[PDB]
UniProtKB/Swiss-Prot annotation:
This is Angiogenin. It is an enzyme of class 3 (hydrolase). The chain holds residues 26 to 146 of 147 of the full protein. Changing Q11A: Slightly decreases binding affinity for RNH1. Changing K53E: In ALS9; decreased interaction with the ribosome and ability to repress translation. It is found in: Secreted; Nucleus; Nucleus, Nucleolus; Cytoplasm, Stress granule. The lineage of its organism: Eukaryota, Metazoa, Chordata, Craniata, Vertebrata. Has weak tRNA ribonuclease activity by itself due to partial autoinhibition by its C-terminus (residues 140-147), which folds into a short alpha-helix that partially occludes the substrate-binding site. In absence of stress, the ribonuclease activity is inhibited by RNH1 in the cytoplasm. In response to stress, dissociates from RNH1 in the cytoplasm and associates with cytoplasmic ribosomes with vacant A-sites: ribosomes directly activate the tRNA ribonuclease activity of ANG by refolding the C-terminal alpha-helix. The keyword Nucleus applies. It comes from Homo sapiens (Human). Changing K39E: In ALS9; uncertain significance. The active site is at H12, H113. The gene is ANG. Changing T79A: Increased ribonuclease activity. It is linked to Amyotrophic lateral sclerosis 9: A neurodegenerative disorder affecting upper motor neurons in the brain and lower motor neurons in the brain stem and spinal cord, resulting in fatal paralysis. Sensory abnormalities are absent. The pathologic hallmarks of the disease include pallor of the corticospinal tract due to loss of motor neurons, presence of ubiquitin-positive inclusions within surviving motor neurons, and deposition of pathologic aggregates. The etiology of amyotrophic lateral sclerosis is likely to be multifactorial, involving both genetic and environmental factors. Expressed predominantly in the liver. Also detected in endothelial cells and spinal cord neurons.
Length: 121
């Protein structure tokens, strides 16, 4: 059952996004099913999937707080933050592009949770 890994990728992985502007956030949040209700904040990791998986090994991760792992490498990310407002569509988002390491939870060698708290700021 790698369904939590597949859901992680749906909520938090976009290999090569192109523009990482407000329109990108509004479109991908709809595409990935995150607008019923409107998720308040959601981050997408970009780049190679093998790098994200490697976070669950000593190859690209350290243990972090109680039960998480933090990556040794930096990743291109885009944080989508709801503007307002309403919990139901239409959902308007502000994009913030960044480049830093990420905090995940691992199960059976695979990422299954992204810790959003480092992208609140
Ligand atoms: Pt979900
Ligand atoms: Pt706003
Ligand atoms: Pt406003």
């Amino acid at each position: 059952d790698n369904s939590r890994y597949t859901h992680f990728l749906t909520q938090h992985y976009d290999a090569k996004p192109q523009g990482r502007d407000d329109r990108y956030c509004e479109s991908i949040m709809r595409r990935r099913g995150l607008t019923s209700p409107c998720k308040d904040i959601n981050t997408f990791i970009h780049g190679n999937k093998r790098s994200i998986k490697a976070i669950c090994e000593n190859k690209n991760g350290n243990p972090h707080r109680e039960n998480l792992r933090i990556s040794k490498s930096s990743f291109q990310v885009t944080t989508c933050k709801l503007h307002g407002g309403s919990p139901w569509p239409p959902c308007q988002y502000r994009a913030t592009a960044g480049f830093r390491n990420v905090v995940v939870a691992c199960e059976n060698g695979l990422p299954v949770h992204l810790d959003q708290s480092i992208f609140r700021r």
